[PDB]
């Protein structure tokens, strides 16, 4: 009786917190993920550092609209982004940090493709992918 | 059992995060009224196409206590603000943006009136208001 | 059935907005307590407000990693912060506002000791603590 009340003011709440952030530009939400930044630009493990002590995951686009959400961010900091996956043994295949194989790619046209062993992945600011050296200063984007 | 302790520390931590918000001065809590702003001066419809993407609106005091709040962030930006509501077809009457018709009003003396059909309302920095036209460059500040 | 559901996502969303708000270092998560300051320095009594007016209280670490959140604060702006106690009657002892008596206490080598009735306590950038009054300009930290 009174949990339905108390549920509606903490839902209307969360919306309320989660509206401002969203206002003044934090955060992106897509579905159940939600992106962030705070414009810095380090290398790749720099990164994976802060987004964990942040309680969140180096972010990566599991889908078009995702990868989009990424994409506007690099866009919008003008810099390029570092994304939660590094590539296998076997050159050309790779997987998400955890372990699971990449499964949505949006790689430019030829790539993957260059010299190196476990390379990183880096968006461009046009939303398309490039494989390369991981100790490249790239824009730290989180999702939670 | 379980329910009782996290309810507590859901509201505990929305407590903290809506603290953390006030602190940083991002938001004004009236009620069940959130007012926020980004900062930026823009005109009316674009005022409501930023706060909708926030999953807000474009604010509207409806009580003498809303309408201050509002002003405080109005003089704090030192710019006036477009509030949410225009007028009807028969001048001198004016709706909130869904339709009903403006109930709580803060006219500077001898307002409403100008030239103009479907006018909107600014704000000025001492909280009466003052109707005119759309286009001009006003504090975008929205409600969750 | 659904209750389950939802708090999860209620749950989820919380961590994500503590999880935007920790990346963009507007706050610090230590057990349930929350550190966080608005970057001003003011005296004691206007730190108090600040921090109430917010909701919270002004910061006072009661655990060596409470104290070390704060003095990460401290750090980061090179300010010195007040802490939330004040001396007693009994000169060499302090409470906590409410009226407790100070329990975990990191005085710097010799302290407390000065000039004056009812003294502050300010926090060094090393997070050691030192008494003296309470109209300096200190980090406001707030709790909550
Ligand atoms: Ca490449
Ligand atoms: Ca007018
Ligand atoms: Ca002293």
């Not at 309320?16 to 290398?43: A, E, R, W, Y």
């Not at 599991?62 to 296998?88: C, F, H, Q, W």
């Not at 476990?118 to 390369?132: A, H, I, L, P, S």
């Amino acid at each position: 009786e009174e949990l339905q009340t108390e549920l509606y003011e903490i839902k209307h709440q969360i919306l309320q917190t989660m509206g401002v952030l969203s206002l003044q530009g934090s955060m992106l939400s897509v579905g159940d993920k939600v992106f962030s930044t705070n414009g810095q630009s380090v290398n790749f493990d720099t990164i994976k550092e802060m987004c964990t002590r942040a309680g969140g995951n180096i972010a990566v686009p599991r889908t078009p609209e995702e990868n989009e959400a990424i994409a506007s961010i690099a866009k919008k900091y003008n810099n390029y982004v570092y994304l939660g996956m590094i590539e296998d043994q076997t050159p050309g295949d790779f997987h998400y940090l955890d372990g699971a194989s990449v499964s949505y790619t949006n790689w430019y046209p030829g790539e993957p493709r260059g010299q190196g062993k476990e390379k990183c992945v880096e968006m461009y600011t046009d939303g398309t992918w490039n494989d390369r050296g991981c100790l490249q200063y790239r824009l730290a984007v989180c999702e939670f």
